[PDB]
Structure 1
Amino acid sequence: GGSMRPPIIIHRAGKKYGFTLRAIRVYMGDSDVYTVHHMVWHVEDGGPASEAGLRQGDLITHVNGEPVHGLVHTEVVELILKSGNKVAISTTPLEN
């Protein structure tokens, strides 16, 4: 795949980061093993995350320098809100 995911610094323009953090615990099958991941379901191409560089349909690996891997639906959101009026969303670029 790729190494060193590039964090996209969004900036809350007095409203929101303009993107949906879809939570999805990817199970490996019938077993209890699963990874708690998240993906931007929809990013508002009107100012925030989109203009920042966040391309819709990307998988978030880290947030503000904190692995999202294992964070619950609201934990990622909080991690972002916690950052302040902005946040470094680490997404996974394309790969062969």
Structure 2
Amino acid sequence: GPRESKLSKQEGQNYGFFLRIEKDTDGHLIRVIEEGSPAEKAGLLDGDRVLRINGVFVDKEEHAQVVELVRKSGNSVTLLVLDGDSYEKAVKNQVDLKELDQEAKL
């Protein structure tokens, strides 16, 4: 289910991913995670959607805002992410994404 990913990096360093809007696709997508990066080390996966940034729900914010939020968070940031399939399955079944909290399968 959702995961809380605690990213941390050095000054001048990128976290090492793209945030994207994709044509006819819901959500703020994480793509092209660089090998060995802060993003990788924190558990980010290709196709994850960003639900929250430092606990603030952003699924309905504009891309520019979501980017700004990451950027203004400085050299650490907490992302609540959901994998692409769980995210599409949640939106399919009209689940309230706001009410989703961390869940792990073991």
> Offset of 1:66 from its aligned partner?
0.9
| CA distance in structure 1 between the partners assigned to 2:24 and 2:69 by the alignment | 21
| CA distance in structure 2 between the partners assigned to 1:70 and 1:25 by the alignment | 16
| CA distance in structure 2 between the partners assigned to 1:9 and 1:45 by the alignment | 17
Where is the helix percentage greater, Structure 1 or Structure 2?
2
CA 1:57–1:44: 2 relative to 1, 3 Å: same
2:76 pairs with 1:79: no
Partner of 1:68: 58
Partner of 1:6: 3
Within 5 Å, give how 1:28-67 maps onto structure 2: 37-67=27-57
Stretches of structure 2 lacking an aligned partner (at least 5 in a row): 90-106
> Which residue identity lines up with residue 70 of structure 2 in the other structure?
I
> Which residue identity lines up with residue 9 of structure 2 in the other structure?
R
CA 1:69–1:50: 2 relative to 1, 3 Å: same
Q: Percent identity?
A: 34
**SS, match of residue 8 in structure 1:** strand
**SS, match of residue 84 in structure 1:** coil
Q: Compute the TM-score of the two structures, normalised by the length of structure 1.
A: 0.72
Q: Compute the TM-score of the two structures, normalised by the length of structure 2.
A: 0.66
Where is the strand percentage greater, Structure 1 or Structure 2?
1
Stretches of structure 1 lacking an aligned partner (at least 5 in a row): 28-34
Q: Deviation string for 1:5-31 (max 9, x for gaps)?
A: 22211112331111111124857xxxx
| CA distance in structure 2 between the partners assigned to 1:12 and 1:48 by the alignment | 6
- When the two structures are aligned, how many residues end up with a matched partner? 85
CA 1:60–1:66: 2 relative to 1, 3 Å: same
